Write a protein that binds this ligand. Structure first.
Ligand code: POV
Ligand code: POV
Lengths: 32, 50
């Protein structure tokens, strides 16, 4: 519970970083 | 999106499912093993609840 609650936390900081910095629409093939 | 990815994992957990069908082979293995995960969780829950 000490490690795997930090694994989910690292995956959640990346997932905000992909959501905010990269949109979903214009032209973004192979992007992150 | 991140809404579309999170209520795939919640949608396939409560056996209802969302729209959100993966199309690449790399995401049909994540989705295909989360369906087998939540098949064993629900079947072990409803067998012990008896
Ligand atoms: C109880 C419930 C908990 C579940 C919640 C879990 C998932 C919830 C989060 C889901 C993320 C939302 C994705 C938005 C859809 C993408 C579309 C887009 O790009 O425009 C977005 C831009 O704004 C953003 O970029 C979104 C950033 C949201 C913060 C990142 C998640 C925070 C995680 C913390 C919590 C997670 C911890 C979870 C703990 C369990 C939407 O903007 P708009 O207002 O529609 O206008 C369009 C603007 N535009 C024209 C510039 C594009
Ligand atoms: C029915 C409803 C579900 C149907 C699913 C049926 C599927 C077939 C399932 C199992 C078939 C394999 C036979 C296992 C039985 C023998 C036991 C055995 O050897 O287990 C071995 C492991 O073996 C596994 O763990 C198998 C797990 C496979 C999961 C397949 C998911 C499919 C998702 C598809 C995604 C692709 C998406 C496609 C995208 C295009 C070892 O176990 P053991 O040594 O015997 O005992 C434990 C002792 N020990 C702890 C020391 C190790």
């Amino acid at each position: 519970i000490g490690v795997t609650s930090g694994i989910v936390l690292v995956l959640l900081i990346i997932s905000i970083l992909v959501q905010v910095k990269q949109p979903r629409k214009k032209v973004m093939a192979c992007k992150t | 999106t991140l809404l579309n990815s999170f209520w795939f994992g919640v949608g396939a957990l409560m056996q209802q499912g969302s729209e959100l069908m993966p199309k690449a082979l790399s995401t049909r293995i994540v989705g295909g093993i989360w369906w087998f995960f939540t098949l064993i969780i629900i079947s072990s829950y409803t067998a012990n609840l008896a």
